């Protein structure tokens, strides 16, 4: 019913990539569903890594097959993907997958986890406030998330209690190679003096969480 992917977001070149998938809403035991991994790469479309089902029936993608190891744990409800001799060509968003039927169609898909393949070091973001630039009865205020690596960051407002009028912009790669993005929320102007707005920035690759309160300039 629902799928989740976990594992490191950064891998150094020539090192092995390990990822785990946890399935909820379904047994991992049924006649017959294979369970699996598919990936998406920048500058190209989807590439099927392959799927495994118990006891040990597996399918592997050619070229990939030599590096690639895949194991299924039925007891935990967890599946694991391993890929060796990782090269920049393996930088990709990896999706957990349920195969259906030998299977030919994939659903549902896990949200996916980014993996960047680089020798560069990890760096948490610097978060700076953007003070409220008004439309009558509505002001925009936000957070600037600068110089982080690698992707992604997530942003919420007031611990998730704010969803109306929230927009988070796509990140920018820079000449430095550090990413930056910003997130903004539209709020009633009358509320600025009485209500406190806090953006919650999460960056899993560096295990950084930053909660920045944004104050109106005086």
């Amino acid at each position: 019913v629902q799928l989740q992917e976990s594992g490191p977001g950064l891998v150094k070149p020539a090192e092995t990539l390990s990822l785990t998938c946890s399935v909820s809403g379904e047994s991992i035991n049924t006649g017959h569903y294979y369970w699996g991994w598919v990936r998406q790469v920048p500058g190209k479309g989807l590439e099927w890594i392959g799927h495994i089902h118990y006891t040990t029936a597996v399918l592997h993608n050619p070229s990939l097959k030599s590096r690639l190891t895949i194991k299924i744990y039925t007891l935990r409800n967890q599946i694991t993907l391993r890929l060796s001799n990782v090269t920049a060509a393996d930088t990709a968003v990896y999706h957990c997958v349920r195969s259906g039927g030998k299977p030919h169609w994939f659903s549902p898909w896990g949200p996916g986890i980014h993996v960047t393949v680089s020798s560069a070091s990890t760096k948490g973001p610097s978060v700076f406030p953007l003070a409220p630039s008004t439309s009558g009865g509505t002001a925009a205020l936000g957070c600037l998330v600068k110089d982080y690596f690698p992707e992604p960051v997530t942003v919420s407002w007031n611990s998730g209690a704010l969803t109306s009028g929230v927009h988070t912009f796509p990140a920018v790669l820079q000449s430095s190679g550090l990413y930056s993005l910003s997130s903004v929320v539209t709020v009633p102007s009358s509320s600025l003096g009485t209500q406190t707005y806090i953006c919650n920035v999460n960056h899993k690759p560096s295990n950084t969480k930053v909660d920045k309160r944004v104050e109106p300039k005086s």
Binding site: G45, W48, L59, L130, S133, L144
Partner: peptide, 29 residues
């Protein structure tokens, strides 16, 4: 032994109304 994927097609709908951008500019904090 194998599943194969097409390269993907970007689909745009071509009859849609123009919408002017909203621009917000922020100085350094």
């Amino acid at each position: 032994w194998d599943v194969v994927f097409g390269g993907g097609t970007k689909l745009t709908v071509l009859g849609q109304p123009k919408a002017a951008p909203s621009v917000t500019l922020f100085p350094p904090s």
